[PDB]
């Protein structure tokens, strides 16, 4: 929680901690008043929606994590709120607990990575060592997040502080050293996380065709 | 497809009873409950079912609802009730908030009371004597206190210590304490603290003679 | 824990989480190794001594808080020292868990305070307020707490924020308005505690006599 | 009644093994268990019964016990393995604890290995040419990276990058990017990237032809 920044068009879910109880999620643009969105009741595993969202809240639930999300679709800049989990008795028509908000702003200036390989040279030192990578160029705001092979490879790695060029976009790279000999068999893929645009890319890094 | 309007706007002093209304057409037909809400924060439940008090929330808070007109009460309101209040209303339909209010609780100008202190008879017998000097809740923080032995002046033999603001009524207060020896304590009689502060119309002497009732 | 200063001839409280596993008690002079105590086994209710101590080492415990204490008494200056709880299972001589140390440092300059009374005035206001106190002086180091009648009475209390005097020591006030109608028949006793000097006291405020 | 006794001082770099002994009359006849301790935190348990090691205790540390002498053994140190370590006996008696060993993980002058990285073909369908030096597991912290282009030197056209001192090595390592647009990229043959630091004797540069394999 805390703040998340989300680009015109993306979604933003909300979750949610899920007996006779209903969860709510209400929202709170800066400086204004308390906004219903929807609800859902763990006990009959039924939604309620709000008109005033057409068809952009989605509501779904997880029995095994008793969790309940609240999905909102196809933002915009009048999306800019808070967002808050809450949760009263079954038909009473109040809410006793408040879970922390979440403030959502909406940006028209967020922009999703472009993701390049750094592809290991070929001339790399036989039965020494090889360095790749992922350069992750052109997004807005921070952060992104990379991992190697969903996190399963870690030593070696160095993810670069981002460096704000001077189009006002960020760029990092993320990279490797591995053995050489290892280039012919092993697989190497990053894992690219821009949570503002909802980008989600793997790349497969291999050295370049001759 | 009602709405609910809440004045913006209510301002108390410590200790006033505020009032914050709910209007909506029809609304006494209705459960309403009510939320505070600090900056930052996620809202609290104050009351519900009009008037019923959750667990833990101080009893000055209660409320009412008949007619077109639902209202939250606090009694002796303290600094920290100053937040934002939602009324939320309930038809079984919809779920609908009022706009808010925002409670300010104001801090304007107040004297101190002003009390001395002689030292303890105990406190002699070891040979020192503390006089002490108290502004009572005062505001705002700026005081002036100069003590007098038989009239004179005294300069370096005292230290000042002040509270941070009070959390129920946002005042200050301020001891000064004055340190002489038994001996010299035994030498004069008058033992005077003048007190000068924005509130008074002119500075205040509270005094005190030596072995007296 | 963190850090606690202590006059030479107090003593220390070190207090336990408390089957078939041993407390221990182990310290650390600053820049030194480590040095046990002494020890207390909870199935048995027995405890176990460290001859360099003296009789100094006393070793309780409390079957319903499930807590056991060391007290360290007639501290010295080179009981300066971190104290550790450790525990480890019964017979197998090691210890899986360390909790967090204390830091107790046995100092000279420790002074417990004289308390005096700041008794309200016989010219208070008849059905007004009355103001009362305690002065609590001449101590070293801070803190001092005060509270008055075990803590029951909080409402028209002010206590001061220290002042360090031109002897070096410290000195406070914690007074009370009261209605001056009470006067004569309702009771006020400032609860004054300063932990360095192992100084707990209870003094009555009453309008003095004439 | 008796005493443990330890070198004061163990001192390796990154990827060696530290050996740390623990001496006393007769060791080998009892049971010895190894702690670590960072600075103002409490010792944590990572060897016991000579050689055993408690759940989450990584499988570089291992132990022995034999003769006057137990051995706290740790192979590939890392860094973060800096920290005081004390053996501890149990005879039965008497719990006793050696006077401990500071470990120091030395970091010493490393010269960086230098990698150039072409831009993609995906990359260059786009307009935008990036050329990619890396300088890997260097120290200490000062570095220069002048890039060159068909022999010409590079000014303004070049960003960097560095890491926070690596937990296992303690080691930097920095990238260094030049942006061109495609048109320049297509304009040259020779991209060169030249590095100075302190563990070379003198700058070394890589480089390679666009279009080449």
């Not at chain 1, 680009?7 to 007996?19: D, W």
């Not at chain 2, 009412?64 to 209040?85: F, H």
């Not at chain 2, 038809?91 to 303890?120: E, H, N, Q, W, Y």
């Not at chain 2, 005081?143 to 603001?165: I, M, P, Y």
Request: proline residues 6%; charged residues 15%.
């Amino acid at each position: 929680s805390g703040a998340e920044v989300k680009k015109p068009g993306s979604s933003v879910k909300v979750s949610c901690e899920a007996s006779n109880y209903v969860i709510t999620w209400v929202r709170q643009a800066p400086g204004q008043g308390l906004e219903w969105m929807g609800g859902f009741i763990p006990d009959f595993r039924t939604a309620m929606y709000a008109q005033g969202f057409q068809g952009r809240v989605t509501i779904t639930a997880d029995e095994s994590t008793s969790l309940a999300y609240m999905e909102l679709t196809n933002l915009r800049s009048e999306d800019t709120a808070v967002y808050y989990c809450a949760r009263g008795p079954l038909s009473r028509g109040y809410y006793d607990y408040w879970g922390p908000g979440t403030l959502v702003t909406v940006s028209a200036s967020t922009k999703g990575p472009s993701v390049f390989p750094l592809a290991p040279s070929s001339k790399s030192t036989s039965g020494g060592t090889a360095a790749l990578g992922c350069l992750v160029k052109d997004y807005f705001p921070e952060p992104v997040t990379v991992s190697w092979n969903s996190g399963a490879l870690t030593s070696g790695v160095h993810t670069f502080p981002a460096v704000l060029q001077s189009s006002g976009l960020y760029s990092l790279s993320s990279v490797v050293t591995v053995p050489s000999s290892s280039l012919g068999t092993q697989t190497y893929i990053c894992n690219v996380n821009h949570k503002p645009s909802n980008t989600k890319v793997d790349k497969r890094v291999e050295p370049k065709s001759c | 497809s009602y709405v609910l309007t809440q004045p913006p706007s209510v301002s108390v002093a410590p200790g006033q009873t505020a009032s914050i209304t709910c209007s909506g057409d029809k609304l006494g037909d209705k459960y309403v409950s009510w939320y505070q809400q600090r900056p930052g924060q996620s809202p609290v439940l104050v009351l519900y079912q009009d008037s019923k008090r959750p667990s833990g929330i101080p009893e000055r808070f209660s409320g009412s609802n008949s007619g077109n007109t639902a209202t939250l009460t606090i009694s002796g309101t303290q600094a920290m009730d100053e937040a934002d209040y939602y009324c939320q209303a309930w038809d079984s339909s919809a779920l609908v908030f009022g706009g808010g209010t925002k409670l300010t609780v104001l801090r304007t100008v107040a004297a101190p009371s002003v009390f001395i202190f002689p030292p303890s008879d105990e406190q002699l017998k070891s040979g020192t004597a503390s006089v002490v000097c108290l502004l009572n809740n005062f505001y705002p923080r700026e005081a002036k206190v100069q003590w007098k032995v038989d009239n004179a002046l005294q300069s370096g033999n005292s230290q000042e210590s002040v509270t941070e603001q009070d959390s129920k009524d946002s005042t200050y207060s301020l001891s000064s304490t004055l340190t002489l020896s038994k001996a010299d304590y035994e030498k004069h009689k008058v033992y005077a603290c003048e007190v000068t502060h924005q509130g008074l119309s002119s500075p205040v002497t509270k005094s005190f003679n030596r072995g007296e009732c």
